Amino acid sequence: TDAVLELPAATFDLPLSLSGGTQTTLRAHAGHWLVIYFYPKDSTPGCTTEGLDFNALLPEFDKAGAKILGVSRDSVKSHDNFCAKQGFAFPLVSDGDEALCRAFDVIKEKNMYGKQVLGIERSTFLLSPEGQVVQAWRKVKVAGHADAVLAALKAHAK
Ligand code: NA
Ligand code: NA
Ligand code: NA
């Protein structure tokens, strides 16, 4: 009923490699809200802006008991370097095989260059404490985005 996206059951049990060397799973986040934001490339202008915007709002996400994960297909080492340089205090998922991206259907195609080109589309999702995807943002406009995600989270958490 309140879901806007249906994930395969196996998605919740995928081992997600994090910055810092640990793994998590979506099921492991049961009981609290989770924001999952997908971005195309570590250490690029839009991605950095977006990460810094979420980072600045962490205390507000904490007030709601929520956790945040950023996701791209960059390596763990790339993510470690990005987090250290920018001072991020939330983890980044190294989705090298795009398993998580595919589950959320964020790998989109564009007819360009006389080719069919596939890439990550900047997208964000709100996962409830019982693992339902209750809100989505696709083709994300970075300016104002983290603020909008926080506002939506607060509205839902009631
Ligand atoms: Na960086
Ligand atoms: Na959750
Ligand atoms: Na939406």
Swiss-Prot record:
State its role.
Thiol-specific peroxidase that catalyzes the reduction of hydrogen peroxide and organic hydroperoxides to water and alcohols, respectively. Plays a role in cell protection against oxidative stress by detoxifying peroxides and as sensor of hydrogen peroxide-mediated signaling events.
Q: What is its EC number?
A: 1.11.1.24
Similarity-based family: Belongs to the peroxiredoxin family. BCP/PrxQ subfamily.
Q: What is this protein called?
A: Peroxiredoxin Bcp
Which species expresses this protein natively? Answer: Xanthomonas campestris pv. campestris (strain ATCC 33913 / DSM 3586 / NCPPB 528 / LMG 568 / P 25)
Q: Quick one: a GO cellular component term?
A: cytoplasm
Q: What class of enzyme is it?
A: oxidoreductase
Pfam families reported in the protein's UniProt record: AhpC-TSA
UniProt-listed InterPro entries: AhpC/TSA, Peroxiredoxin_BCP/PrxQ, Thioredoxin-like_sf, Thioredoxin_domain
Q: Where is the Thioredoxin domain?
A: 3-158
Q: Give GO MF terms, alphabetically.
A: thioredoxin peroxidase activity
Q: Where is the active site?
A: 47 (cysteine sulfenic acid (-soh) intermediate)
Its recorded reaction(s) are: a hydroperoxide + [thioredoxin]-dithiol = an alcohol + [thioredoxin]-disulfide + H2O
Q: Its quaternary structure?
A: Monomer.
Other comments on record: The active site is a conserved redox-active cysteine residue, the peroxidatic cysteine (C(P)), which makes the nucleophilic attack on the peroxide substrate. The peroxide oxidizes the C(P)-SH to cysteine sulfenic acid (C(P)-SOH), which then reacts with another cysteine residue, the resolving cysteine (C(R)), to form a disulfide bridge. The disulfide is subsequently reduced by an appropriate electron donor to complete the catalytic cycle. In this atypical 2-Cys peroxiredoxin, C(R) is present in the same subunit to form an intramolecular disulfide.
The chain's disulfide connectivity reads 47-83
Q: Which PROSITE patterns match?
A: THIOREDOXIN_2 (PS51352)
Q: State the UniProt keywords alphabetically.
A: Antioxidant, Disulfide bond, Oxidoreductase, Peroxidase, Redox-active center
Single Gene Ontology BP annotation? cell redox homeostasis
